[PDB]
Ligand binder design. Structure first.
Ligand SMILES: Cc1ncc(COP(=O)(O)O)c(CNCC(=O)O)c1O
Lengths: 428, 428
């Protein structure tokens, strides 16, 4: 019956929506900095029958019979994570970046203890202390920020905050920050005040894997990440860290926070970690970084600067560009909408001391990983940069038709998932 | 290169383990009561490009652009969940059953407040108050159990416990209880002490959908569930409940507990909920219940009883049989391994006042949903029951090859995922 019928017959509405979403991914230039495109092999793993297996516990130490093969899968993911990042242990079960962070904080601190993280308006993530998230609900929160003049994190200010606040755990990490964190300084501060150091490398983990961003693994007690940003894998989380925290972290993931792990997704993590060690992946990360720098450079040209648009920190060393619109007629929402009309997906971004409401903002976050994965190199990012610069410098009266044509030409020149409609679930 | 190459080329190790796990599911008789076999259409949804979309928020209330198609997907899953279960609201984003429960308790109580659930050694889940789980670490836990003579939950005893303990939230639900809960009595008790009532229907959600188990939705404030047990869907969680809790529950899922939802998995939830309304699904649930009763009856025969093996509560009204091995030379691990050798996959399971260590147990949990999905009916479950009975009554001196041949004949007669090696990711 329906056990073997194709999706198109069982649920035509959902089949049609899958096709529409594939078409949307193909037709747009995706520049949300946290998004990417998974490889075919990760699609296959996530669509595998490993979803049927209950496998609570650890490899070879399960609460269920029949785990012999998913145990090898999980050990491959763990071993590849440790090897790729140079970490002493890995836990590959977190369902997401948020669940990775929930388990780390569960392992390292108790409710009521003090957590120090980067403020949301200064580029932090909601799991770094936002009051409606578990990180704010369970813990006493302190925050550091960026210098208002340079938009860099001032490590003397972070140190002064840590000395006053005496956190149990310091989080280094970000969702919207354009420069390299000083992990050695974070470790020195953590040691000085007796705090644990968590680095949440979700955004830049793929840059780390390719050797293009300093690694937090030498410095941090524990490192959390999403698998699905620059690392380029399926939507899920991952923890690595120093051996002395392995037992606490494993127990915090299960039974502390989760039940059964998603073994099909863990199989895809193993695939993504293997891909992340290849020269092809390293070149993709190189094109990600070069493309972001090309966009930042274009947006610092005099024509854009004279229009009241500026680049936060005067450049970038990562996979994104942060745009400051405080002196522009465009607010973040208006600029996001304008770029959507051209076919480019970005998101608005709060700037520190933002004069506009938090859902409007005076900033943009523009990311390059997804287009680099799609195949864009320096020539294509030069074109993308000029499209964005023309829109932002001119404003809402810009010739959108011409920019849309240019964006469509790029999308057509670099087909996405070409052949997916013929790929099989398993085999070749 | 690697973006479009098949898994078999990118990662032969993982490709081979996918084949081995599929072979294992085909070759064994999978009788873990919390497992099932997802349909082809759910494999396709979970292997879809919807993994690439960040969609924090709710349909029509997203933080990022481009969600016009995943919004319809999520609305279909929500509307089908509400219609199938007769519920006033649904949140379809929980990553797992554990994450569904974490969000419910986040919404309904504060750290330090009192939680009353079924004791783990009496059939309850670790998210109902176990010391190392968030439900035990964040909250003050009380427990009710089963009557020692009948192994039934005594609602007079539950009421006495609630009157003395004064819980903020009462959980009704179980992972290893073989009888039907009295939801009217739980509601009466919750009202008497001013508690919220959460029903965790993870195990019996599919029985409820088919009309073969009383629904908790009329009585409960909120109902949590896994999608992947008797409901037969992809590995994930779901919450439904009364409309006055919709805002608190939605906020507790995001940004309370989670970040971005797994939209590919939510697409599969929509598919599974549609299948769960079909006559084919109801017949599968009917065969699940009849098969479990056949096994329970066979294991209460004198030859099994003489071997020190008994059936908890003297039968079953649900999809599982709980076997008590306290008077048997077999412990739970030994029986799990012996059944594995004859081709039947189960899990050991704790029993009240267990004389054996907790990782070993004095019990077995045997479930029929996966084999019912595979197509087994009363004739096949009669043979399964006799195989299990012979192994448990004879122990280590049983003719393993003779029993393994009988299990293999059943597996060969009911091919599993026949044709999967030819199915496509999308389309046919
Ligand atoms: C009753 C009940 N509630 C929650 C869970 C946890 O779901 P998961 O998706 O594993 O996080 C379970 C799972 N119990 C596993 C089992 O019974 O084998 C559950 O039973």
């Amino acid at each position: 019956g329906s056990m073997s019928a194709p999706l198109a017959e069982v649920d035509p509405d959902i089949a049609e929506l899958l096709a529409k979403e594939l078409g949307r991914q193909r037709d747009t230039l995706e520049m949300i900095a946290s998004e990417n495109f998974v490889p075919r092999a990760v699609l296959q793993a996530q669509g595998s029958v490993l979803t049927n297996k209950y496998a609570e516990g650890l490899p070879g130490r399960r609460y269920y019979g029949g785990c012999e093969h998913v145990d090898v899968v999980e050990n491959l993911a763990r071993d590849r994570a440790k090897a790729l990042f140079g970490a002493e242990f890995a836990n590959v079960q977190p369902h997401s970046g948020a669940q990775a962070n929930a388990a780390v904080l569960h392992a390292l601190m108790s409710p009521g203890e003090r957590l120090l993280g980067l403020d949301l308006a200064n580029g932090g993530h909601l799991t770094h202390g936002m009051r409606l998230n578990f990180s704010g609900k369970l813990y006493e929160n302190g925050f550091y920020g960026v210098d208002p003049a340079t938009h860099l994190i001032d490590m003397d200010a972070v140190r002064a905050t840590a000395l006053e606040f005496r956190p149990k755990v310091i989080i280094a990490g970000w969702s919207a920050y354009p420069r390299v964190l000083d992990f050695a300084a974070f470790r020195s501060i953590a040691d000085e005040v007796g705090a644990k150091l968590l680095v949440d490398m979700a955004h830049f983990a793929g840059l780390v894997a390719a050797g293009l961003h300093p690694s937090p693994v030498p410095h941090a007690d524990v490192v959390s990440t999403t698998v699905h940003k620059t690392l380029g894998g399926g939507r899920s989380g991952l923890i690595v860290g120093k051996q002395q925290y392995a037992k606490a972290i494993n127990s915090a993931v299960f039974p502390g926070q989760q039940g059964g792990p998603l073994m099909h997704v863990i199989a895809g993590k193993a695939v993504a970690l293997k891909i992340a060690a290849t020269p092809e992946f390293a070149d993709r990360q190189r094109r990600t970084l070069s493309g972001a720098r090309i966009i930042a450079d274009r947006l610092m040209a005099p024509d854009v600067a004279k229009a009241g648009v500026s680049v936060v920190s005067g450049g970038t060393d990562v996979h994104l560009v942060l745009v400051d619109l405080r002196d522009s007629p465009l607010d973040g929402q208006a600029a996001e909408d304008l770029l959507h009309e051209v076919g480019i997906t970005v998101n608005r971004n709060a700037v520190p001391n933002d004069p506009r409401p938090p859902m409007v903002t005076s900033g943009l976050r523009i990311g390059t990983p997804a287009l680099a994965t799609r195949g864009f190199g320096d020539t294509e990012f030069t074109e993308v940069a000029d499209i964005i610069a023309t829109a932002l410098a001119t404003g809402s009266s810009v010739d959108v038709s011409a920019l849309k044509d240019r964006a469509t030409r790029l999308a057509r020149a670099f087909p996405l998932y070409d052949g997916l409609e013929e790929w099989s679930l398993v085999g070749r």
